[PDB]
Chains A and B, each alone.
Chain A
Amino acid sequence: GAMNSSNYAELFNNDIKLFVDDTNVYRVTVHKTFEGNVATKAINGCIFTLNPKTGHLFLKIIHTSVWAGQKRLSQLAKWKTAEEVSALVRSLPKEEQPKQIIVTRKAMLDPLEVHMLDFPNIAIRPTELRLPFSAAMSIDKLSDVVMKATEPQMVLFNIYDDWLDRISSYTAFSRLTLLLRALKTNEESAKMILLSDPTITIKSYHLWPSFTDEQWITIESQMRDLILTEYGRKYNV
């Protein structure tokens, strides 16, 4: 059934599972036409498929060409997401295929279920968690690879960099969702926090700076503060 704060630790057991987030699959700018009507222009998107235990990210880049001459694009995006997740599963060796896929938006269940009919022993699950995975395009290197793409492309990342050498998946995942939640509520400040210090760099094979343990603690506190402030502002509490 649905994932929530109760069955939260299940994410970190040894059953292979993937999160699928479709929020950035169909991305548009909106503009005015010469005649003064509104039109959309599509930009490149991505399916965010993440193993929360290992950090392996399967970043399936969605090139604007896939929308060419298509109608009901937001509906189609869900079906193209499920097509691509299904093809990813089929591409994995059997012992690597997930036992569960957790979709971050309920509207993906039926498309994914229908695309996964060949995989009846893979459970498709919704979630009640409000996961910040839409903010994945606030990670500079993921945005860069999506926006430069000239064709459909799968790019593989570890979204935890080398954190698992030092911390558990559980702690890694909470760090990731904390960072992403801050980038989602106030990207400008969140990104300032991460880079204020020119001496902490991002390795070429990483997404995030090479913070020491002590620096991560100060960071994580700086992100919580940011999240809490933005909340009082949003609601006037």
Chain B
Amino acid sequence: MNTVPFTSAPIEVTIGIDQYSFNVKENQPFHGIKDIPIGHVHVIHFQHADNSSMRYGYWFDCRMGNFYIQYDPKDGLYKMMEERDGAKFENIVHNFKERQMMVSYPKIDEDDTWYNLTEFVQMDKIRKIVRKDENQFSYVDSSMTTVQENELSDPAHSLNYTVINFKSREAIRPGHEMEDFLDKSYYLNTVMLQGIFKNSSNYFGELQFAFLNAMFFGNYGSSLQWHAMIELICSSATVPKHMLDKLDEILYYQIKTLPEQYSDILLNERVWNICLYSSFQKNSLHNTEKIMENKYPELL
């Protein structure tokens, strides 16, 4: 059970850890989050009480080091940093637990939600989408744009998602124009699965990471990427059966976890009505279809 201590909380902020979050008042004595479950990636994220713009946060994995939060008053945000002094850190953490200034990661034991949202997400793949290799953790915010968004400006601060584009030479073999555009199987299985992602789990991990960035930070380009990776599978007549059943599970927990109030900008009407009702895989997403219908019949 790992810990992420905070040096202080100088400004009023809503702190999130995974799908949980807490209100923290200006110069309230808050000094960390304990009992963070080992074995999964995590994200800790922030929204200042004064600037409901700019949600931001840090993807991390406690196996990869000892991380803490510190407020930087020059840059004006909560920063994740790594403590290299292993002893100096158990000291900070133990003394803060002793003074009981830390919140407990509040997992219900029956609850597999976080595992299901993060099954395929690996910190090593996250660090390739958010390139900043001096740090073992990854910063994401509301306004970061993707590499695709840019082609149509600062690269040090981009989300290097895999570019998917249905009207491109990559997507369309010469001679199979019509076939490859109506049935994307070629582009999914040879180009993307065997070619780029190598296997289905890295693909699901990018899909799942894009969703979580869209959900937690309202990152509009992540949402585009999430929908595109869905659409590619659903628009392919030939998908391994194991990918179809896993996808249904993946989407179900994503749709389940979405805030009810946000289903208007996070959910793309056309992609979903196509995937659930028109695509080759219309019949392969029973659990995802049933929860969409019962919870957002308006969008359909």
Contacts and interface: CB of A to CB of B under 8 A. Distances in A.
Interface in A79-138: 79, 82-83, 110-111, 113-115, 117-118
A118 B174 CA distance: 9
- Chain B interface helix/strand/loop/mixed: loop
B230 to A, nearest CB: 20
A76 interface: yes
Contacts of A79: 177-178
Nearest to A72: B182
A110 B168 CA distance: 11
A113 B178 contact: no
Nearest to A115: B177
Q: Which bucket holds chain B's interface residue count? A: under 10
Interface in B30-58: none
B96 to A, nearest CB: 59
Nearest to B177: A114
B167 A83 contact: no
Contacts of A114: 167, 172, 177-178, 181
A111 B178 contact: yes
Nearest to B172: A114
B167 A117 contact: yes
A110 B167 contact: yes
Interface SS of chain A: helix, strand, loop or mixed? Answer: helix
Nearest to B181: A114
Contacts of A115: 177
Contacts of B172: 114, 117
A121 to B, nearest CB: 14
A71 to B, nearest CB: 12
Given A79-B178, A113-B167, A114-B172, 13 more contacts: A79-B177, A82-B177, A83-B177, A110-B167, A110-B181, A111-B178, A114-B167, A114-B177, A114-B178, A114-B181, A115-B177, A117-B167, A118-B174
A113 to B, nearest CB: 6
A118 B172 CA distance: 11
Interface of A: 76, 79, 82-83, 110-111, 113-115, 117-118
A15 B167 CA distance: 25
15 contacts: A79-B178, A83-B177, A110-B167, A110-B181, A111-B177, A111-B178, A113-B167, A114-B167, A114-B172, A114-B178, A115-B177, A117-B167, A117-B168, A117-B169, A118-B169
A76 B179 CA distance: 10
A76 B168 CA distance: 20
Interface in B152-182: 167-169, 172, 174, 177-178, 181
A67 B181 CA distance: 20
B165 to A, nearest CB: 11
A117 B181 CA distance: 12
A115 B173 CA distance: 10
A89 to B, nearest CB: 14
Interface string B250-271: 0000000000000000000000
A27 B187 CA distance: 33
A108 to B, nearest CB: 13
Contacts of B169: 117-118
Given A114-B172, A117-B172, A76 B167 contact: no
A133 to B, nearest CB: 23
Which residue, A79, A114, A115, has most C-beta atoms of chain B within 10 A? A114
Q: Which 10 A-B pairs give the minimum distances between C-beta atoms?
A: A79-B178, A114-B177, A114-B181, A117-B169, A115-B177, A113-B167, A114-B172, A114-B167, A117-B172, A79-B177
B167 to A, nearest CB: 6
| Most chain A Cβ neighbours within 10 Å, of B169, B172, B177, B181 | B177
A102 B122 CA distance: 47
A115 B180 CA distance: 11
